[PDB]
Amino acid sequence: RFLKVKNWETEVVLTDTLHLKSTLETGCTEYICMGSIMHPDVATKDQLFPLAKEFIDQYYSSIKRFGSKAHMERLEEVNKEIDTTSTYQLKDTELIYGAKHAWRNASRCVGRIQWSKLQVFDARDCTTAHGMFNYICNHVKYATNKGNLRSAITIFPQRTDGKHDFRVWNSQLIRYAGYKQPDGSTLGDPANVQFTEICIQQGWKPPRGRFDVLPLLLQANGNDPELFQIPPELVLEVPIRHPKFEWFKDLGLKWYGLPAVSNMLLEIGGLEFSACPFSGWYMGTEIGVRDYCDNSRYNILEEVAKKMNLDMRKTSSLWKDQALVEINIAVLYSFQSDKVTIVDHHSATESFIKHMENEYRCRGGCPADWVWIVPPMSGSITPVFHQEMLNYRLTPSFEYQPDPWNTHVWK
Amino acid sequence: RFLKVKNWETEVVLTDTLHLKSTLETGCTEYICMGSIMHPSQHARRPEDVATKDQLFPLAKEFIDQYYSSIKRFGSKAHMERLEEVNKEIDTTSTYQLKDTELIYGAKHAWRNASRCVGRIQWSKLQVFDARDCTTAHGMFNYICNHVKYATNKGNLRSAITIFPQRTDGKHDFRVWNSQLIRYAGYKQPDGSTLGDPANVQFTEICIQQGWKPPRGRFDVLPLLLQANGNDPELFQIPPELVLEVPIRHPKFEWFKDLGLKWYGLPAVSNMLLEIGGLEFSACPFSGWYMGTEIGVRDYCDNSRYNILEEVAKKMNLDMRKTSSLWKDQALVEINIAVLYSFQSDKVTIVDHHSATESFIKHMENEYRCRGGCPADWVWIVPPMSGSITPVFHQEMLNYRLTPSFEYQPDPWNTHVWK
Ligand code: HEM
Ligand code: HEM
Ligand SMILES: Cc1cc(N)nc(-c2cc(CN3CC(F)(F)C3)cc(F)c2F)c1
Ligand SMILES: Cc1cc(N)nc(-c2cc(CN3CC(F)(F)C3)cc(F)c2F)c1
Ligand SMILES: C[C@H](O)[C@H](O)[C@H]1CNc2nc(N)[nH]c(=O)c2N1
Ligand SMILES: C[C@H](O)[C@H](O)[C@H]1CNc2nc(N)[nH]c(=O)c2N1
Ligand SMILES: [Zn+2]
């Protein structure tokens, strides 16, 4: 009835009761832990009823109206819609609550101290890819806010029969293209080579550079997706320079200011919002460690280390570690110099511990995925490394979903 | 059913069937994951104190079955006699005694099964010192000294475990009260600060309370506190010539030597329990060699350990007023360069986290290839610095509890009734 988590650095112990409210699977079993597995159909009428009730109950409990006339009538109204239309429609208040709580419940998100400050753009009246483009452009402009970034989500119409899904085919709203060259090398972001190819096949004329912002590939109502160029004045980018290394700007590095995940599914009360792009601001390591230094990504450790004149003939010189730090210093300095919101992994992990402890106080727990919360460099010098965490799946939730090109029926 | 793990760098997919042999709960469920809990489970294979026959024999049979299976017997003459022998021993002493071969097999397989250990590519190259004839803390000291000398080997370190008499009723436990054979003292200062290793403040106070005269310095090698057959523990000073230490200097920063840092070369875990076929070896000090990050990241830079980041950073003349300058990250790298440069210059075995994690990936592939799996705890395997530029960060792992195993146990001073 109670689970305890300890911080081995501070000795603080928190008591988790919230996990009793989880209902969906983590992927582990009693005899094997799948904590590091990355990824461990429409609901029928009878399936949807109890999911809707649980969510409406939770909503009315949250606003201290549980058992109220409004709670009871809403429940009856929801059951009526399910009974008649096999689905139902969230009120705006419920939509905002659900979206904020899916963020609040994202066990892999270190930025959740911000969860209650989320701008929710209801796009459930959207019917076409042009409409989605308009909503997404407004999302980008609002979220970017001339560098003073604001978290935001735009929610497109829910799934109906599974054959009319709204999807943003992009994994993120703003990403750079990748082009495989005849000689085996890759220009730009190798993570996006397949998506870049889909875009070109759909008629995108690529600049064939290292930092081409990809076009939006937007699917409405299960139709074939359509290409749209985000207006370049809406795509805020930061050239990456270094406060001490004059030569760093000569690497030609830049990144975009707005991280905007667009390939996940938002599940609220059994309803599935298959297009729900959301955005916050970057933690610097996402760019400096993963985007720039993953071997499968821009992979710049060698080039930076060369320019640092590091001894690269043996690993134990820690040349990779040395270059990695300087790169991440560069990322933070550049965003800060251009007054583009960014958070370093130390600030972000400290805030998440504060958030986590507050969540245990007021909510009874905070589901947290250590594998994802600990930054990908300098792990043990951030406080989350020493923080025991319990992982469990609460709903509303953000879910992975198959890439749309693996399932789309081309018209 | 049958589980796959993917490496997201290489796209290599491995298929795990070994997990079907797991015995103990992980702590996780279908609904909650406890993979970052230090001690998620208290599920043990044998109950409280001296087990009844229907409790110990099934575990014994299982281990003996496993051992005779390993050597292409099972059902052979010697196996069936061994079951009868173990059966008679439990009938007449409420326990049984491992053969030398079984002890060695058991110790190597506890190491092979240690999901949290990144060094297991070496698992079958393990020197086993049978100390089950030991009877006194003096004898334990003699065995541990021999272990330390053998394992240190003038810097060419060698993996070793020394196995003292198994638990009998729980009142006669052999214990090394030290957490590791070689650790530095920690002193609580009058002004509230801490001198030495703050992790060892309590154990240091116990030693001082037991007559240890501390030199009260930053790197005081602690005495051994040895408990034999349940008796009160006894202090022993490890002969310093057996304690190989490495002065930490930096290949570039000439001022780094002035920090006065050293570390010992031999990491030797002494507070764990070795469990083989229901038998519990409560004193089983084992040692290998260091991954540089254990010293340079955790020992030196944990806030509640030596916590040297600020002083190194000051010497480096870094911007320390804001986290976003990454001054901690900058010093952290130089410290770990220094640690590796120092050990290597002194020809003391050490492995950097890049080479270690690379070898562990290879070990995983080997284990899946011949064994059908390898239990691995990502949370512990990924190094505490530069995680994602190491291959294990990108390697999905499956964690499960195979026996024989190394287990945690209570610190004996919470258990011990003195005399
Ligand atoms: C406001 C500042 C935010 C920061 C600093 C932040 C930080 C992060 C980071 C560093 C990750 C890991 C990303 C990766 O490794 O690929 C992450 C994951 C995630 N974030 Fe946040 N985030 C923020 C806002 C948001 C918002 C506004 C939402 C939703 C409305 C959100 C939902 C998620 C989810 C669902 C994941 C996990 C994705 C997955 O499961 O694979 N985050 N966040
Ligand atoms: C030979 C070189 C070895 C290396 C480089 C190595 C490396 C490591 C490292 C880095 C850890 C994590 C330590 C920590 O963060 O506290 C660890 C844990 C562990 N090692 Fe190894 N190890 C080696 C040898 C051995 C041997 C010889 C044994 C036993 C015979 C062993 C058994 C274990 C166990 C049981 C753990 C987990 C401890 C726990 O759960 O608290 N290791 N190892
Ligand atoms: C809102 C937000 C803020 C922030 N700082 N990061 C992210 C963020 C999240 C992901 C995870 N996504 C799930 C997937 F596997 F599909 C990839 C990937 C990124 F690249 C990101 F930038 C998101
Ligand atoms: C044989 C060996 C080689 C090596 N490289 N490291 C270790 C090693 C393991 C631990 C785990 N300890 C048990 C605990 F949970 F208490 C913390 C702690 C250390 F300090 C170590 F050095 C052991
Ligand atoms: C195999 C492992 O689960 C995978 O590499 C994870 C590790 N932790 C991560 N943590 C974050 N934040 N993002 C990631 O992509 C990953 N990848
Ligand atoms: C809370 C968390 O499990 C704890 O800090 C762990 C994290 N991973 C670790 N990994 C290793 N190798 N050693 C450790 O002591 C720890 N500590
Ligand atoms: Zn788990």
Instruction: Please give the full DSSP string across A323-365, using - where no structure is assigned.
Output: HHHHHHHHHHHHHHHTT--EE-HHHHHHHHHHHHHHHHHHHS-
Distance, CA of B283 to chain centre = 12
Instruction: Tell me if A378 and B386 make a contact (CB, 8 A cut-off).
Output: yes
Residues in chain B, total: 419
For ligand 6, the distance from its centroid to the CA atom of residue B34, given in whole angstroms, is 13
**Which among A121, A119, A237 is positioned nearest to A175, based on CA atoms?**
A237
Inter-residue contact A368 to B37 (CB < 8 Å)? no
Amino acid at B219: F
Option in B379, B399, B400 nearest A370 (CB): B379
CA distance A210 to B148: 56
Q: Are residues A55 and A119 in the same domain?
A: yes
CA distance B35 to A27: 12
Is A7 inside a domain boundary?
Answer: no
Q: Which residue has the tokens 């693996």?
A: A406
Q: Are residues A307 and A196 in the same domain?
A: no
CA distance A19 to A25: 12
**Which among A294, A273, A275, A277 is positioned nearest to A285, based on CA atoms?**
A294
Inter-residue contact B363 to B351 (CB < 8 Å)? no
Is B319 inside a domain boundary?
Answer: yes
CA distance A76 to A80: 6
Is A10 inside a domain boundary?
Answer: no
- The encoded tokens of residue B355 equal 């080479």
CB atoms within 10 A of CB B205: 16
Q: Are residues B108 and B118 in the same domain?
A: yes
**What value, to the nearest 5°, has the Cα angle with vertex A212 and ends A198 and A182?**
60
- Domain span at residue B220 reads 133-158+173-244+408-412
Atom of ligand 3 nearest to the CA of A286: 22
* A13: closest CA of chain B, how far (Å): 12
> Under 8 Å CB-to-CB from B119, ≥6 apart: which residues?
B288, B289, B291, B351, B356, B359, B360
Inter-residue contact A122 to A153 (CB < 8 Å)? no
Q: HSE of A294 in the Cβ direction (CA atoms, 13 Å)?
A: 17
Give the method used.
X-ray
CA distance A328 to A375: 12
Q: Are residues A109 and A129 in the same domain?
A: no
With residue A51 as reference, give the H or E element that holds it. Answer: helix A45-62
Q: Is B95 on the interface with A (CB under 8 A)?
A: no
Is A328 inside a domain boundary?
Answer: yes
Inter-residue contact B138 to B164 (CB < 8 Å)? no
Q: Are residues B239 and B251 in the same domain?
A: no
Q: Which residue has the tokens 């300098």?
A: A378
**Which among A43, A76, A71, A69 is positioned nearest to A57, based on CA atoms?**
A71
| Neighbouring-strand partners of residue A213 | A176
Edge-to-edge strand ranges of the sheet holding B268-269: B127-130, B160-163, B286-287, B268-269
Which residues contact ligand 3 via a Cβ below 6 A? A 111, 171-172, 259, 261, 263-264, 278-280, 282-283, 286
- The encoded tokens of residue A265 equal 């599914």
Is A286 inside a domain boundary?
Answer: yes
- The encoded tokens of residue A22 equal 């989880």
Cis-peptide, bond into residue A396, ω within 30° of zero:
yes
Q: At what angle do helices B77-93 and B53-70 cross, to 10 degrees?
A: 160
Inter-residue contact A55 to A395 (CB < 8 Å)? yes
Inter-residue contact A352 to A344 (CB < 8 Å)? no
CB atoms within 10 A of CB B77: 8
Residues in chain A, total: 411
Instruction: Tell me if B388 and A294 make a contact (CB, 8 A cut-off).
Output: yes
Q: Are residues A157 and A57 in the same domain?
A: yes
Instruction: Tell me if A328 and B323 make a contact (CB, 8 A cut-off).
Output: no
Q: Is B302 on the interface with A (CB under 8 A)?
A: yes
DSSP state of A278: E
Is B388 inside a domain boundary?
Answer: no
Query: CA dist B33 to A229, A348, A374, Å?
Result: 42, 23, 16
CA distance A39 to A33: 13
Option in A29, A320, A333 nearest B389 (CB): A320
Q: Which residue has the tokens 């930096």?
A: B250
Option in A6, A346, A393 nearest B328 (CB): A346
Q: Is A105 on the interface with B (CB under 8 A)?
A: no
Distance, CA of B9 to chain centre = 29
**What value, to the nearest 5°, has the Cα angle with vertex A220 and ends A280 and A213?**
45
**Which among B102, B227, B79, B83 is positioned nearest to B165, based on CA atoms?**
B227
Q: Which residue has the tokens 């997990």?
A: B19
Is B121 inside a domain boundary?
Answer: yes
Quote the number of domains for chain A: 3
For ligand 6, atom 6: residue with the closest CA: A386
Resolution in A: 2.1
Q: Are residues B21 and B164 in the same domain?
A: yes
CA distance A189 to A386: 33
Q: Which residue has the tokens 């590519």?
A: B121
Inter-residue contact A180 to A236 (CB < 8 Å)? no
Q: Are residues B97 and B239 in the same domain?
A: no
Q: Are residues A224 and A330 in the same domain?
A: no
Is A95 inside a domain boundary?
Answer: yes
With residue A255 as reference, give the H or E element that holds it. Answer: strand A254-256
SS (H, E, C) chain B: CCEEEEECCCCCEEEECHHHHCCECCCCCCCCECCCCCCCCCCCCCCCCCCCHHHHHHHHHHHHHHHHHHCCCCCCHHHHHHHHHHHHHHHHHCCCCCCHHHHHHHHHHHHHCCCCCCCHHHCCCCEEEECCCCCCHHHHHHHHHHHHHHHHHHHCCCCEEEECCCCCCCCCCCEECCCECCCECEEECCCCCEEECHHHHHHHHHHHHCCCCCCCCCCCECCEEEECCCCCCEEECCCHHHCCEEECCCCCCHHHHHHCCEEECCCEECCCEEEECCEEECCCCEECCEEHHHHHHHHHHCCCCCCCHHHHHHHHCCCCCCHHHCHHHHHHHHHHHHHHHHHHHCCCCEECHHHHHHHHHHHHHHHHHHHCCCCCCHHHHCCCCCHHHCHHHHECCCECECCCEEECCCCHHHHCCCC
**Could you tell me if residue B229 is left (phi over 0), alpha (psi between -120 and 50 degrees) or otherwise beta?**
left
Query: Does B382 show up as a binding residue in the annotation?
Result: no
Inter-residue contact A143 to A150 (CB < 8 Å)? yes
Q: Are residues B139 and B103 in the same domain?
A: no
Q: Are residues B82 and B200 in the same domain?
A: no
Q: Are residues B97 and B147 in the same domain?
A: no
Q: Is A23 on the interface with B (CB under 8 A)?
A: yes
CA distance B74 to B62: 11
**Could you tell me if residue B271 is left (phi over 0), alpha (psi between -120 and 50 degrees) or otherwise beta?**
alpha
